[PDB]
């Protein structure tokens, strides 16, 4: 009867086209502002002093870029970790010079993605679902907050944060290799196993369902039209695909349970990306990966090279060349 | 300096295959409106 109850009834209605919910009250204003500023800053945005040395790096399309090289540049080294909104900038020209829109996009992104995650919970509550799709979405939220939030914190500047682009991503990955040795760190190892394993069990499960489909169509029409939507009959012989994989490797390595099978597809990647995103986090605070340089010696004591020493000389090439003007002192403490 | 044959590569790489996929949809809906027998078959 009241105005608030007629507003709570609408905002929590599943009869809307898109469910809004109470998290959409701060998902939609956040992500539309992260979007509408990203499209403008990617297309039309002046160059940005990223190294704090007043050498402005172009990143937008109107200043001679493309899809690959164009990128929303991170904020300045001069700012660093300080909060830099528009009203604390004394003009928009001073805001866009010093890496303004990187903080406006990222902070409205991480609020909107952490609200998109809670929104996946909310609709599962109002639909009668068991709730935990949003726990599986915690794994890219862990990884998005690792390269945009946690790594600028432990390194003390948003300038070490990830550039919102495509070539800026590979500037981020290579400089992160030289300074932290991520490939030898066992948490990037535990998530390469998460996505190689994840793409394995995806294409391994998706093939054994498509292999054992039941005849419901003719050879002229499509294979997919043998599934009517909302039917109650099972659309594939699960005993058939169990007997196949029960002979392809051996018998006891096969899940006859389809529920425990469809749980292992959700376990393996998500655990692999939780562990990986806490690799960037523990390497944000300079707890680097393994270092086996000069580890094998002869009885005389001369250093015998290994593959890690060849990997070290690739890291030394990126270390002596990243931010080639920003350094003045012999050790990259930042 | 960009290659001036790339405009012909991209804008025909967009339009010619994308206008192809539109045609397979329009004749799909015409066959469905063709069999249905009401007001649109002719």
């Amino acid at each position: 009867v009241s105005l608030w109850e007629r507003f709570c009834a609408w905002i929590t209605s599943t009869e809307n086209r898109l469910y809004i919910g109470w998290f959409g009250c701060l998902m939609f204003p956040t992500l539309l502002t992260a979007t509408s500023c990203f499209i403008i800053a990617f297309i039309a945005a002046p160059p940005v002093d990223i190294d704090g040395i007043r050498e402005p790096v172009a990143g937008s399309l109107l200043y001679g870029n493309n899809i690959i090289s164009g990128a929303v540049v991170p904020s300045s080294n001069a700012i660093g970790m300080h909060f830099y909104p528009i009203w604390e900038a004394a003009s928009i020209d001073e805001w866009l010079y010093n890496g303004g829109p990187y903080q406006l996009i990222v902070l409205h992104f991480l609020l909107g993605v952490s609200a998109y995650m809670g929104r996946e919970w909310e609709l599962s509550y109002r639909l009668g679902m068991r709730p935990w799709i949003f726990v599986a979405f915690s794994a890219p939220v862990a990884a998005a907050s690792a390269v945009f939030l946690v790594y600028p914190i432990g390194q003390g500047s948003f300038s070490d944060g990830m550039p919102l682009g495509i070539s800026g991503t590979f500037n981020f990955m290579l400089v992160f290799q030289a300074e932290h040795n991520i490939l030898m760190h066992p948490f990037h190892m535990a998530g390469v196993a998460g996505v190689f394993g994840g793409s394995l069990f995806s294409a391994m499960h998706g093939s054994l369902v498509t292999s054992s489909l039941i005849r419901e169509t003719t050879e002229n029409e499509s294979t997919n039209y043998g599934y009517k939507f909302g039917q109650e009959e099972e659309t594939y012989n699960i005993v058939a695909a169990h007997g196949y994989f029960g002979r392809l490797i051996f018998q006891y390595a096969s899940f006859n349970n389809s529920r425990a099978l469809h749980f292992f597809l959700a376990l393996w990647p998500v655990v692999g990306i939780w562990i990986t995103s806490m690799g960037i986090s523990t390497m944000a605070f300079n707890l680097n990966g393994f270092n086996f340089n000069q580890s094998v010696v002869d009885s005389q004591g001369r250093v015998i090279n290994t593959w890690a020493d060849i990997l070290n000389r690739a890291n030394l090439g990126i270390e002596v060349m990243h931010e080639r003007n920003a350094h003045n002192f012999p050790l990259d403490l930042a | 300096e960009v290659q001036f044959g790339a405009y012909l590569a991209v804008l025909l790489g967009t339009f010619l295959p994308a206008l192809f996929l539109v045609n397979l949809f329009i004749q799909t809906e015409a066959r469905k409106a063709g069999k249905a027998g009401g007001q649109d078959s002719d």
Binding site: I43, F229, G230 | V2, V10
Partner: peptide, 30 residues
């Protein structure tokens, strides 16, 4: 002149995302 093509590809991609969400073929039981 060159960046005009890149912008048209980007907003043209966001058009077909708009039509796929709102003008989707709504699936129906029976």
């Amino acid at each position: 002149m060159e960046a005009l093509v890149y912008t048209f590809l980007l907003i043209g991609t966001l058009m077909v995302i708009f039509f796929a969400v709102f003008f989707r073929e709504t699936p129906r039981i029976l």
